[PDB]
Nucleic acid binder design. Structure first.
Ligand SMILES: [Mg+2]
Ligand SMILES: [Mg+2]
Ligand SMILES: [Mg+2]
Ligand SMILES: [Mg+2]
Ligand SMILES: [Mg+2]
Ligand SMILES: [Mg+2]
Ligand SMILES: [Mg+2]
Ligand SMILES: [Mg+2]
Ligand SMILES: [Mg+2]
Ligand SMILES: [Mg+2]
Ligand SMILES: [Mg+2]
Ligand SMILES: [Mg+2]
Ligand SMILES: [Mg+2]
Ligand SMILES: [Mg+2]
Ligand SMILES: [Zn+2]
Lengths: 116, 178, 119, 124, 60
RNA sequence: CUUCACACAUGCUACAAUGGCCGGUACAAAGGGCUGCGAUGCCGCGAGGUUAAGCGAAUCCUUAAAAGCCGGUCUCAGUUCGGAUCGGGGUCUGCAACUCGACCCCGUGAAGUCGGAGUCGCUAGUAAUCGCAGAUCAGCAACGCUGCGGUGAAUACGUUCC
RNA sequence: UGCCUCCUAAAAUGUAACGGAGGCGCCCAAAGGUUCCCUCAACCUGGACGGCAAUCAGGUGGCGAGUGUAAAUGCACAAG
């Protein structure tokens, strides 16, 4: 059942089914399903089209979802780079930016081992 | 009797004479063919395009398409000559004007985060070509009973002489430009 | 231009069968020429290029014949079948003009096999 | 044999399977669950329903009562002896392939003539 | 070739969630296609750092 | 003193159903506190904010122990497992949090499906696991160290081999 | 060491050398016959994955592609 262009997977409870939208976690998925009137323990295959109109307008007026959230995150990284801040130089090289330890770790911002 | 063809010779046909000063009424542009192809380049392996690109364009466009072979062999792309690599349909007449309506009205705003189609995509003569994403947007195929997702590109061929003459035609049919 | 393509690609087909079918004074060539409105026909004798008989659907006898365009093709086929026999011709080769043999041109020839010509 | 992708914990689940073509019953109250990384041998005399048992797992038949459950990591591999089989005037190269040069044996690219030659059919 | 090779292409009734409806010809079985967005209810069919400083702190 | 193609070492959190999450609900011990502990009430989704009772303390505060019990939900999936990384928005302490603080919220949701050769601890309230407090300290990189209690096992024929 | 093609070969044919370059000891049940239809390569503009180049659309393009197989004579009227 398409909601924002995300294709909610069938046979999944609606408190969890909204979390596959980029920009909605477990906390937002409680308050999406409190404004409309949809109970949490509802399967997504029993999802009436009259219900799905009630959460294609509360999301597009109060949250930020695919496309125009993902174009903000890769624009906020883009802002830090050309101004030449410390986190911009640290975003170019792929080294971790929040003052992490880079001597024995930081295998997520880097790849696997190189073993010189 | 399609509703976009009768809308063409009701106000689009008259509006093109005021914007461009045509002497004779035979000079007014008109879309002639809409060419839709898949371009299944990953058919040089695994040989699955019969259910792939034939049983879905027939659902989208209406008629069975043409399996196109390949002209010459390319070693870097791992195909040889005469290998089925593309699938194409051609829409003329009443099924064409029923396709440009069903594209712009119900289909084309199902592109994910749709913002429009670029009007810089003319060839220089007055013909238009745009691409799509997958076996989404057209409702006639279903999201369940399909194979891997595959996109397309759609040619729109007009009788117009220059670009902005063909831009004024496709503007009045309902194409969203930006 | 869809009209320039049709003329260029019908004097190419008409030259395709002209390599093999000429027509002489003993066996003339029944050239057909078909338009949307009429059909024209002439026996040409390609050794000096001199027509010996002609018929068309623009003279008033063919024009007042009832029926569709195939019915007016039977009448022009009967006319050149009885104008060639008034010039001493009984055997001819048939020239398609570059068209598909069928429909109106097939009804011209089949009307001229019942009335004297012997192809 | 080419290795497939990683297999999960549920391979095939069968819960109270019934299969029959007439008043004769072949399978009645059968419950099992196929393991992972093993070999299951099926035993029976002639005309007892061994091949109909495979055709409920691949889905080419339909259970009368009870269900078969597969599981999202399972990708099968099975060809009947009778529904398409082989074609008696296509060559052995264009039955494995379909006239193509390179084929997909599961997320890898191998040549078709290097694949039929791995199965004995070598040379002309 | 134009005889039962192509799939069935019969007249089709479309409706939207807006309430808009029209009538075309499509291959959907039943001719009862129901969409949730159309050309008359979709957006785009109808329409700094200094200012973000000032809401947090204010003017000097 | 915190750098980073890498290499080793001691830990913590994991890979799930003897589990996650949600609602209810029972049982400690040892400690700290006037340049402090902040009850209660109100405000804040929360970290906190404000007002201020009581206490140099078996009196008042720190103090709701968590595992557990009962009920519901998920149904074996890189998932309602895992919570790394990163984006945005806040609090507090301090003259000051960019290099370099912890905490909170919202979003993002990486490796990981029990680990090669090899190696380590432990013989009973032990091991395994669950929390709580102290010292240093404005705050804190506290998963460390020194302590505290909760639940609570398996085996030991025997002295050939290491 | 026999057979096919070109230069040597001196504008018919022919012409030698342990002169200069290559092929052949097949293949095709259609790649044979016939009727009918079509025009290529390269380049340029636009286009989901798509890149110099897959498939699509439009311009320009008279032979620069192609010919089961060497090379010559030919073939766009096509013998493609
Ligand atoms: Mg140090
Ligand atoms: Mg979790
Ligand atoms: Mg609880
Ligand atoms: Mg409160
Ligand atoms: Mg329980
Ligand atoms: Mg698992
Ligand atoms: Mg992995
Ligand atoms: Mg001891
Ligand atoms: Mg401290
Ligand atoms: Mg000579
Ligand atoms: Mg001479
Ligand atoms: Mg030799
Ligand atoms: Mg043939
Ligand atoms: Mg040919
Ligand atoms: Zn609408």
């Amino acid at each position: 059942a398409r909601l924002v262009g995300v294709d909610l997977p069938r046979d999944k409870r609606m408190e969890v089914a909204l979390t596959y939208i980029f920009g909605i976690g477990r906390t937002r998925s409680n308050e999406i399903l409190a404004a409309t009137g949809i109970d949490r323990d509802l399967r997504t295959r029993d999802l009436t089209e009259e219900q799905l109109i009630h959460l294609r307008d509360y999301i597009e007026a109060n949250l930020k979802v695919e496309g125009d959230l993902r174009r903000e995150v890769q624009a906020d990284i883009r802002r830090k780079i050309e101004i030449g801040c410390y986190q911009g130089l640290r975003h170019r090289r792929g080294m971790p930016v929040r003052g992490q330890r880079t001597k024995t770790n930081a295998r997520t911002r880097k790849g696997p081992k190189r073993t010189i | 009797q399609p509703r976009l063809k009768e809308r063409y010779r009701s106000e689009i046909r008259d509006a093109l004479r005021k914007q461009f000063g045509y002497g004779n009424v035979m000079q007014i542009p008109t879309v002639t063919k809409v060419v839709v192809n898949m371009g299944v380049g990953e058919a040089a392996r695994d040989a699955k395009l019969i259910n792939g690109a034939v049983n879905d364009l027939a659902l989208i466009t209406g008629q069975k398409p043409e399996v196109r072979r390949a002209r010459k062999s390319i070693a870097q792309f791992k195909l040889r000559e005469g290998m089925p690599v593309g699938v194409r349909v051609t829409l003329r007449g009443d099924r064409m004007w029923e396709f440009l309506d069903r594209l712009t009205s119900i289909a084309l705003p199902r592109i994910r985060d749709f913002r429009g189609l670029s009007p810089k995509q003319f060839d220089g003569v007055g013909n238009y070509t745009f691409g799509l994403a997958e076996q989404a947007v057209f409702h006639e195929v279903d999201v369940d009973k399909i194979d891997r997702v595959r996109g397309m590109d759609i040619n729109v061929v007009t009788s117009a002489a220059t670009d902005d003459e063909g831009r004024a035609l496709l503007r009045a049919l309902g194409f969203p430009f930006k | 231009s869809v009209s320039a393509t049709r003329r260029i690609s019908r004097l190419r087909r008409h030259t395709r069968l002209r390599k093999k079918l000429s027509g002489t004074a003993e066996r003339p060539r029944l050239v057909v020429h078909r338009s949307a409105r009429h059909i024209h026909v002439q026996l040409v004798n390609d050794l000096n290029g001199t027509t010996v008989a002609a018929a068309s659907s623009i003279e008033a006898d063919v024009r007042g014949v009832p029926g569709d365009k195939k019915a007016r093709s039977v009448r022009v086929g009967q006319l050149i079948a009885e104008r060639a026999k008034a010039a001493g011709i009984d055997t001819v080769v048939f020239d398609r003009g570059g068209y598909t043999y069928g429909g109106r041109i097939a009804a011209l020839a089949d009307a001229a096999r019942e009335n004297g010509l012997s192809f | 044999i080419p290795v497939g992708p990683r297999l999960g914990n549920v391979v095939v689940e069968v819960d109270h399977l019934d299969k029959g073509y007439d008043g004769r019953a072949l399978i009645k109250d059968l419950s099992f669950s196929l393991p992972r990384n093993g070999i299951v041998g099926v035993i029976g005399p002639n005309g007892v329903g061994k091949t109909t048992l495979f055709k409920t797992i691949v889905g080419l038949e339909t259970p009368d009562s009870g269900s078969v459950k597969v599981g999202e990591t399972v990708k099968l591999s099975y060809v009947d002896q009778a529904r398409a089989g082989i074609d008696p005037r296509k060559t052995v190269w264009e039955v494995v392939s379909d006239g193509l040069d390179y084929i997909q044996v599961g997320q890898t690219e191998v040549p078709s003539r290097a694949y039929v030659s791995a199965f004995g059919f070598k040379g002309p | 070739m134009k005889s039962d090779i192509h799939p069935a292409y019969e007249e089709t009734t479309v409706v939207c969630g807006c309430g808009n409806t029209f009538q075309t010809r499509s291959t959907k079985p039943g001719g009862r296609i129901v969409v949730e967005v159309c050309s008359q209810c979709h957006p785009f069919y109808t329409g700094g750092r200094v200012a973000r400083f000032e809401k947090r702190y204010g003017k000097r």
